[PDB]
Structures are given as structure tokens and as C-alpha cells.
């Protein structure tokens, strides 16, 4: 499978308000994908985690979701 950084443009990892790209980092649930799946570096991942959590408080990213399967 592809990684998220691999299929994406040049984006601001620090902009908490850009949902279209930030949504691509959550999973089927609201969970923040691991580095195995985001292709991010050690430092980039630390920044993403913090920006996603910021967007979650503005109401733009979901804290958790429901899985439609099983």
C-alpha cells in the first residue's frame, strides 16, 4: 500500500485548519495513523500529532469514529 506523504503535495504540517489534508492522516476511526502508514519522519510525526489535536478542538477533526464493517 501507499503512504500518505507519498501521495500528497507540498503541505503545511503546522496549519491546523487545513482539513482536506489533515483528514487524510486519520484512519477509518479518528485515530492518528502510525509512522508506518504516514511515511513521516520522527520530527514530522510529532508536529502532525499536535496539529491534529488542535484541529480536533476546533471541531474540524473527529476524536473517534464508528467502524462500518464486521
Amino acid at each position: 500500500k501507499a503512504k500518505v506523504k507519498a501521495t500528497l503535495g507540498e503541505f503545511d504540517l503546522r496549519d491546523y485548519r487545513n482539513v482536506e489534508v489533515l483528514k487524510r492522516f486519520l484512519s477509518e476511526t479518528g485515530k492518528i495513523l502510525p509512522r508506518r502508514r504516514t511515511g513521516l519522519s520522527a520530527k514530522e510525526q510529532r508536529i502532525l500529532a499536535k496539529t491534529i489535536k488542535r484541529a480536533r478542538i476546533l471541531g474540524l477533526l473527529p476524536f473517534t469514529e464508528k467502524l462500518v464493517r464486521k
Binding site: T64, L67, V68
Partner: protein, 116 residues
Amino acid sequence: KRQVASGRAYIHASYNNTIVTITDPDGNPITWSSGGVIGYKGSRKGTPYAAQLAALDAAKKAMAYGMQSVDVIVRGTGAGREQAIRALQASGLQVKSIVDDTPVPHNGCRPKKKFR
């Protein structure tokens, strides 16, 4: 005596029992069943067979109110979690969708010694 004809079926599966509630589309229940509602008494409630007959009993109970379509909601890890869904599919109630909504905390309340 209601004629709802479409609604939700919540499967609550724990290791000691499986119990099924069938509600109208805005969540108010209609009928329900469990491993204890059918004959079983002890540890046999948390068996997959009990889960089967439980789902099926609540299914036939919802037929009386005229249900056809069902949106399945599943909570918990337990034996006969899958066995109860498979019963609901075969029950005749058309299964619209299936969602696992098991509530997991964000690590807030200290668990009983059993769960640490």
C-alpha cells in the same frame, strides 16, 4: 401495535452473556431478548448458541411489529458476537449495515483489579 418496519438492532456481547435490543430508527427500543430470556441460566448464556437463539428471539419479536430492515450495532468482545450477527442475517430481517461501536475510554477510570 406500532408498525415501525425499519430500525436498529444493538448486540451487547460480553463474556458472560449476549443480549439484543431492537429499536426504532430514533433509538427507542421495541423488543429485546438475551441468553437468559431464552431458557439458559448459568454460564450457558455466554455461549454462541445462546447468542444465536437470543438474536432470533428478538428478531421474531420484531416481526410482530412488522420490521423488515435492520441496522446492526455491535458493542463488546464476547463469544457469539459474530454468531449473533450471523443469526440476524439469516433471521429474515434484511441487514442494512453493521457497525462496531464498542465504547473504549481515553484512559479515564481506574479499572477493577480483574482488568489490570
